[PDB]
Amino acid sequence: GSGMYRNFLKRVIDILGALFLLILTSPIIIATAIFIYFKVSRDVIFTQARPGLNEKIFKMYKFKTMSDERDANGELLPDDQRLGKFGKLIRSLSLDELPQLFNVLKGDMSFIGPRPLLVEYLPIYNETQKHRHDVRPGITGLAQVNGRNAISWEKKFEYDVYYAKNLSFMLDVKIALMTIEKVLKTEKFNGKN
Ligand SMILES: [Mg+2]
Numbered sequence: 001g002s003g004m005y006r007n008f009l010k011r012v013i014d015i016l017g018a019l020f021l022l023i024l025t026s027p028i029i030i031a032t033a034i035f036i037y038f039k040v041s042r043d044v045i046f047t048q049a050r051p052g053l054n055e056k057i058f059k060m061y062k063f064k065t066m067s068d069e070r071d072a073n074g075e076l077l078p079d080d081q082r083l084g085k086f087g088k089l090i091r092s093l094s095l096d097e098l099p100q101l102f103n104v105l106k107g108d109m110s111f112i113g114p115r116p117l118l119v120e121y122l123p124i125y126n127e128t129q130k131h132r133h134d135v136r137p138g139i140t141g142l143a144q145v146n147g148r149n150a151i152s153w154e155k156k157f158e159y160d161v162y163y164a165k166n167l168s169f170m171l172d173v174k175i176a177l178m179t180i181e182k183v184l185k186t187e188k189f190n191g192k193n
Contacts, residue, residue, distance in 0.1 A: 005169045018105035050116040055133045058108040061099035113138025114160040132160035145178040
């Protein structure tokens with residue numbers, strides 16, 4: 001509600017962590033940007049408009065992995081050829097997700113929180129599920145680690161509202177412990193799925 005973690009510490013940890021991981025992965029960030037510039041597209045970064053804290057829209061950064069080659073007809077060539085071989089390798093290693101660390105540093109996102117979903121889901125949320133945006137979206141979160149017993153979207157949102165209601169340092173540490181434990185490694189919200 002008004003503790004010093006929800007109103008101060010969590011943001012400070014987000015800033016220190018995003019800054020550290022940006023420096024820690026900076027050679028990979030520069031290398032990935034160089035390859036994409038010469039092999040994929042000279043516009044290295046593209047943004048994804050997503051609703052964030054208080055449903056405020058932000059630009060979620062991501063590396064481009066597909067080309068802009070269309071058919072003279074005007075339509076873009078399918079993903080079959082537009083995704084180079086290295087494009088898969090960048091995707092499989094989630095290297096294109098590294099710019100999201102900057103969204104965390106910007107305050108657009110947190111290290112822990114609900115997943116930033118499509119802007120089309122805003123009218124579909126019910127008044128209970130809309131509380132999922134009472135906190136910053138996260139790279140990981142409570143619903144993300146509970147992907148085994150939550151195949152439906154309403155179960156993931158129940159974890160989202162529960163997280164925004166009970167946001168504490170101990171809950172974040174718990175979510176972080178379960179995320180490491182993931183050492184072991186489609187429908188689209190319709191209002192009833
Ligand atoms: Mg990826």
